[PDB]
């Protein structure tokens with residue numbers, strides 16, 4: 001078929017499975033959330049928590065699907081249909097090394113639900129405690145071993161792909177051991193080889209040798225808020241793509257529809273980026289496509305705490321809070337607008 005509705009398998013959408021309900025999970029997990037203290041504020045801060053009640057959840061927006069459980073099969077079905085609507089072929093799943101049965105259950109349910117809709121799943125390896133190249137290798141082995149035969153397990157030209165959040169917290173001399181073909185614990189040329197995509201944060205002076213010395217296969221930028229880092233400043237993307245091409249690296253810029261996290265980080269107002277009826281999303285996606293990249297990542301499907309979600313949101317006013325919503329756009333606007341941009345990306349790919 002050539003209908004302009006097919007999934008794009010070089011479009012990665014960051015997905016969070018950490019939401020719970022009392023009924024399914026024992027608590028309204030993540031809908032309830034600690035309010036972060038101001039890093040530059042008082043020492044006697046008692047910031048408190050967002051309770052995760054119907055009236056007060058840990059987001060400046062409100063989900064169309066309500067306080068959902070990420071463990072709910074019928075929620076997962078609806079999410080996969082939303083991915084199909086958005087034409088986002090790859091779900092990039094947050095992964096925290098929780099080593100707990102409830103997470104194992106969610107990962108299998110997600111894989112299964114994804115496959116029914118021909119969606120692929122890769123892992124977004126988060127900064128778990130004492131994360132280091134050795135336990136990273138052990139975890140990569142476990143993930144490939146356990147899920148590598150699942151039909152929804154993502155591969156690019158035969159290789160799995162991982163995004164590594166806050167990769168800069170690990171020295172390139174450690175990365176080399178895992179990622180150089182000559183490294184003492186290398187995955188190169190093994191059954192566990194993978195495209196490893198590190199987080200480009202700051203200036204090229206720092207990031208270029210980091211990426212090269214660490215032997216990452218590519219880089220992404222994550223942050224939905226333009227200007228937050230050098231990497232998340234879209235006017236740098238043409239130059240970043242040029243460098244990537246010259247150095248055999250895969251650049252996967254991250255685009256998002258907006259940013260606001262002030263429910264959980266009330267001191268963080270300067271990082272707010274307004275949606276302006278979709279214009280912000282359009283401007284950022286336009287810049288990625290114009291940089292001539294081979295792949296694009298979307299921040300995010302459902303990071304509700306940070307207001308970067310494309311998942312449908314609805315107007316809601318409670319006695320506790322008046323939520324933001326999609327203004328003059330329908331709840332599914334960001335899904336259908338994503339499909340539009342995917343079309344434009346494919347057109348110039």
Ligand SMILES: OC[C@H]1CNC[C@@H](O[C@H]2O[C@H](CO)[C@@H](O)[C@H](O)[C@@H]2O)[C@@H]1O
Pocket residue numbers: 094124126127165303305306
């Ligand atoms: O997935 C990458 C990155 C995206 N932003 C949130 C990061 O997780 C932190 O912040 C969450 C609230 O937004 C919080 O619930 C997590 O525990 C973590 O502090 C995530 O690593």
